[PDB]
Amino acid sequence: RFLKVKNWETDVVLTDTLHLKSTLETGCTEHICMGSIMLPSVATKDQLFPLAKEFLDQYYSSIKRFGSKAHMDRLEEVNKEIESTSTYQLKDTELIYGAKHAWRNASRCVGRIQWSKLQVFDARDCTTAHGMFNYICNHVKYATNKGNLRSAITIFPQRTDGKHDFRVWNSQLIRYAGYKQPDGSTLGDPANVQFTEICIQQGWKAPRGRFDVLPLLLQANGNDPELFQIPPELVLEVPIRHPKFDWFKDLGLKWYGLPAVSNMLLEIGGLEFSACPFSGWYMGTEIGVRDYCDNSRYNILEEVAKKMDLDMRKTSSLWKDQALVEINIAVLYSFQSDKVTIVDHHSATESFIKHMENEYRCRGGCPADWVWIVPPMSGSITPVFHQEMLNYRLTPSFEYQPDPWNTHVW
Amino acid sequence: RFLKVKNWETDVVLTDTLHLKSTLETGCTEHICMGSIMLPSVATKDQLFPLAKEFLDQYYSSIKRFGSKAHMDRLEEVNKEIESTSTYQLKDTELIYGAKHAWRNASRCVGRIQWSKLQVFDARDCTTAHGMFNYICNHVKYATNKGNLRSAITIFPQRTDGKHDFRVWNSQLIRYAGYKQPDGSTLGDPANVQFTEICIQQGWKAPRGRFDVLPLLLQANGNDPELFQIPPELVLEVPIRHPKFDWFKDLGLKWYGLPAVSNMLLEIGGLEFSACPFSGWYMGTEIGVRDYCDNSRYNILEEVAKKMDLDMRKTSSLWKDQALVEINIAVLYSFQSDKVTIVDHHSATESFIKHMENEYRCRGGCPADWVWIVPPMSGSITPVFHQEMLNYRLTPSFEYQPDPWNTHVW
Numbered sequence A, B: 001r002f003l004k005v006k007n008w009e010t011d012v013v014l015t016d017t018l019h020l021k022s023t024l025e026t027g028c029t030e031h032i033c034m035g036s037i038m039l040p041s042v043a044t045k046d047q048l049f050p051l052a053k054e055f056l057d058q059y060y061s062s063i064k065r066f067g068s069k070a071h072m073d074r075l076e077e078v079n080k081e082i083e084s085t086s087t088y089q090l091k092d093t094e095l096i097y098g099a100k101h102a103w104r105n106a107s108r109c110v111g112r113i114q115w116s117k118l119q120v121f122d123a124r125d126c127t128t129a130h131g132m133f134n135y136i137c138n139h140v141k142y143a144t145n146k147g148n149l150r151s152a153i154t155i156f157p158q159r160t161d162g163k164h165d166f167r168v169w170n171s172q173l174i175r176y177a178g179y180k181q182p183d184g185s186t187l188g189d190p191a192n193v194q195f196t197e198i199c200i201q202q203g204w205k206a207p208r209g210r211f212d213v214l215p216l217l218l219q220a221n222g223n224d225p226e227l228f229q230i231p232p233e234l235v236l237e238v239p240i241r242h243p244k245f246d247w248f249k250d251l252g253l254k255w256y257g258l259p260a261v262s263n264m265l266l267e268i269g270g271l272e273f274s275a276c277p278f279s280g281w282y283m284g285t286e287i288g289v290r291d292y293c294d295n296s297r298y299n300i301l302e303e304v305a306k307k308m309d310l311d312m313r314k315t316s317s318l319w320k321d322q323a324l325v326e327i328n329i330a331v332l333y334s335f336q337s338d339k340v341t342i343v344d345h346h347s348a349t350e351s352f353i354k355h356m357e358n359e360y361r362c363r364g365g366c367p368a369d370w371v372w373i374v375p376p377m378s379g380s381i382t383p384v385f386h387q388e389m390l391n392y393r394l395t396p397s398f399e400y401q402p403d404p405w406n407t408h409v410w
């Protein structure tokens, strides 16, 4: 009931008691571990108050006023609001706490050493897609900060009945389009082929190229979603060059500076925020390994190995690995030479171990998803490979949610 | 009760029903996933017969004579032997089945496409450490096969009372020694510093160098273990050169051809074989990434990056990654140019996916430990990174066991 996690590169042992506070379930059982399943699986007033109480008890505990008078009155006040409306409203402070701790609690996120320095934009007064556009533009501008990127989240009104959701239909605020071709190939980002055509369905005039920034498809208060184009000046992009290979620029690769996930759901005290785009900055491998080198993505190991004049005749020449390192040196170099925030997988994984020690010390644990924390290349030469991690579900939290076009009564 | 695993690089879906046959437990619960914990945790006649029956039922099922007369007689015969002796003896055929399926069931093993082509050496008539030496030498000679390596297992007598165990005290039949220095550094393999000194305690005269093959410490029928030196001619080694960098030979690196784990316990029908050294061949990354480049192992990223004249001033130059690829190209090249069996992580992981499809098809599942199946470099450019895997414990199985010097009443 007081579990131990060991680091086998350092022989460091941390004791986890925070998992005792875990509420949700993991997918694993006593007889089957589901740690590698990608996705693991209306709210009534009866279920709502325990969740509110739990949250308010940790909120008031954190500001060193647990059991104080303001706590009991707020507990009473939220119960009375749940009785009347079968829901309730968070104070601005409780909203900022919840979002920060949802990030703190995101076990798949290696970037959490920064969780307390999160900028919370309260967009709960928003009523229209245009207002969402406005809020999102201000989010992008603020988080981008001329390349000195800043963590931020914009929180649209919470789900109520269920038929009146706010959704950003983009999976990220800034993504490149993906078009299939006559010959069945894929121009741009294959990940977004369906979403690109959804925008073309709703009326997007596509500039059928590679790195075309998709429009925003914004649904407000359950209404049908509406297209908006982010001002190009707000979309900071990095052309990818290599510090040695001058042909690398001829690849014409570029990526956007700001990673901003917009398809997740934020849970705070049983309240559900279906539109809560959050942004930080990139770990280099996200672009250089996954985005560029996944087979089902841009898939450029082919061309880079060619230009490096690599032995591509069999697997065992490791030409794939060799080109993968050059690509990631190029992403990091390009971002840093442009003063656009980025972190290499070595710095970020070391920071995550330091983060883990802090959390185990000043919190009794740190839920962590090894499958997702270990970077997609160079696993074992980073310290997280050798770090045992306990995964468990704490709340406030970020949850997955269906794509809105699969669920929306149209 | 009929779980689905998806490959997200291929959109392939496999349905797992074999997990229903799972007996042991995983360490995970509904509320906590332990998929990244390295190690997860006398036998009476009462518990013994269900385990025998279970095993014999799958054995006779596999030879298409389940419920036949020979099955019932063997079930009766083993029950009568458990009644009399509170244990029993496997037929040679049942021993070969059990070992093969223990390997088939090893969820952390990416090499299992070969599980049915395993050479089983029955050493259950062995009574002394010298007989163990003999058997082990013949194992090494056979499995090595002049570089055309062959899978094999040597199975010493099963545990009886518990105080009469056969143990190989080496973690692998062939490992390099590790010596600490006056300046507290480490010559050779730091992994084996304690075991190297244990041999020096029992009387090994150490040639305090780098790649000194350790002696065998063999315990037979519970007696104190005894030192034996494998004939050098039986120990096949590969000098590590690079196909491009001629200074690479000046590193003077070499590794042994034959990976043969000797510290695990083989469970077959409730019977426990505490000495069961098994060998196959190397996946390249085991040597080139873990053995050479773990901080707590040979730790040669330092020197290789130096000779490559790499920018070693900060992490973000990826000099560590770059040197890691060159080292693994060198291991694969050196082994292949010497006709010593080796498999690169690309070929082995592709084979494991093919293996998985076979098992799900002709067996309903394949327990798999993603944390261990994904190679320690280039994770996501291999197909197992994108493959969801269910981990669960099937028997016959290979289990960990305490190091014998921690348990042996001396």
Ligand code: HEM
Binding pocket: A099, A102, A103, A106, A108, A109, A110, A111, A112, A114, A118, A151, A152, A153, A264, A278, A279, A280, A281, A282, A283, A286, A343, A348, A372, A398
């Ligand atoms: C500040 C720099 C940040 C870095 C370097 C970072 C890095 C990462 C990485 C590499 C992942 C793995 C997911 C993937 O590979 O697609 C991840 C996951 C995640 N991050 Fe962070 N992140 C940062 C900021 C944030 C912020 C500000 C939030 C929330 C406010 C957040 C919440 C999450 C969540 C919920 C996941 C899980 C995603 C999923 O399950 O698909 N991260 N992060």
Ligand code: HEM
Binding pocket: B099, B102, B103, B106, B108, B109, B110, B111, B112, B114, B118, B151, B152, B153, B264, B278, B279, B280, B281, B282, B283, B286, B343, B348, B372, B398
């Ligand atoms: C034939 C070629 C083989 C290859 C390429 C191979 C490869 C691997 C690799 C890379 C691992 C990961 C463990 C580590 O990184 O230390 C592993 C684990 C394992 N293998 Fe295989 N193996 C082979 C043969 C065998 C055989 C013949 C057996 C048993 C008879 C076996 C049983 C196991 C077991 C029990 C584990 C889990 C080890 C642990 O939990 O520490 N393997 N294998």
Ligand SMILES: N=C(Nc1cccc(CNCCc2ccc(-c3ccccc3)cc2CN)c1)c1cncs1
Binding pocket: A259, A260, A261, A278, A279, A280, A281, A282, A283, A286
């Ligand atoms: N630095 C960052 N990174 C990052 C952080 C959180 C989440 C993500 C993206 N996580 C996507 C995981 C995923 C989910 C679904 C599918 C998928 C694909 C096809 C069909 C169905 C589902 C695929 C993937 C990744 N293959 C990136 C940041 C982005 N914002 C703030 S920080």
Ligand SMILES: N=C(Nc1cccc(CNCCc2ccc(-c3ccccc3)cc2CN)c1)c1cncs1
Binding pocket: B259, B260, B261, B278, B279, B280, B281, B282, B283, B286
């Ligand atoms: N190709 C092969 N590979 C392979 C297969 C099975 C097992 C292994 C070795 N698995 C070792 C995992 C391990 C266990 C304990 C400790 C440890 C270290 C210090 C203290 C306590 C425990 C460390 C490690 C690895 N870091 C390699 C083969 C070897 N034979 C036949 S195939």
Ligand SMILES: C[C@H](O)[C@H](O)[C@H]1CNc2nc(N)[nH]c(=O)c2N1
Binding pocket: A035, A036, A037, A038, A371, A372, A373, B008, B385, B386, B387, B388, B389
């Ligand atoms: C099958 C597997 O769960 C899937 O590919 C996961 C593995 N680990 C990951 N880790 C990160 N950071 N991002 C991912 O998309 C994935 N994908």
Ligand SMILES: C[C@H](O)[C@H](O)[C@H]1CNc2nc(N)[nH]c(=O)c2N1
Binding pocket: A008, A385, A386, A387, A388, A389, B035, B036, B037, B038, B371, B372, B373
């Ligand atoms: C903490 C973690 O479980 C540990 O380092 C594991 C991770 N995955 C591994 N995978 C393999 N193949 N071999 C290992 O030694 C390990 N070590």
Ligand SMILES: [Zn+2]
Binding pocket: A028, A029, A032, A033, A034, A035, B028, B032, B033, B034, B035
């Ligand atoms: Zn699990």
